[PDB]
């Protein structure tokens, strides 16, 4: 079945989203929970994360 096509960013991105030191992993692990369970739109979730981070990243 192969069906492989992770390069647009999912690869490097993945290993990245798994580090955002400003949020909890419950929610974060959530988006990616779909990356591993369903590596179809893993990239898109990544966008949703950096967003959840940039907002709650600073000490605000």
UniProtKB/Swiss-Prot annotation:
Subcellular location: Secreted, Cell wall
Domain of life of the organism encoding this protein: Bacteria
Immunoglobulin-binding region B repeats, residue ranges: 2-59
Applications reported: Important immunodiagnostic reagent because of its ability to bind the Fab and Fc fragments of a wide range of mammalian immunoglobulins.
Role played: Plays a role in the inhibition of the host innate and adaptive immune responses. Possesses five immunoglobulin-binding domains that capture both the fragment crystallizable region (Fc region) and the Fab region (part of Ig that identifies antigen) of immunoglobulins. In turn, Staphylococcus aureus is protected from phagocytic killing via inhibition of Ig Fc region. In addition, the host elicited B-cell response is prevented due to a decrease of antibody-secreting cell proliferation that enter the bone marrow, thereby decreasing long-term antibody production.
Similarity-based family: Belongs to the immunoglobulin-binding protein SpA family.
Subunit structure: Interacts with host TNFRSF1A; this interaction leads to the stimulation of both surface expression and shedding of TNFRSF1A.
Protein name stated in the entry: Immunoglobulin G-binding protein A
Gene name tied to this protein: spa
Residue range from the parent sequence: 212 to 270 of 508
């Amino acid at each position: 079945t192969a069906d492989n096509k992770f390069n647009k960013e999912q690869q490097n991105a993945f290993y990245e989203i798994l580090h955002l030191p400003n949020l909890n992993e419950e929610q974060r692990n959530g988006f990616i929970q779909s990356l591993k369970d369903d590596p179809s739109q893993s990239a898109n979730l990544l966008a949703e994360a950096k967003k959840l981070n940039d907002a709650q990243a600073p000490k605000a």
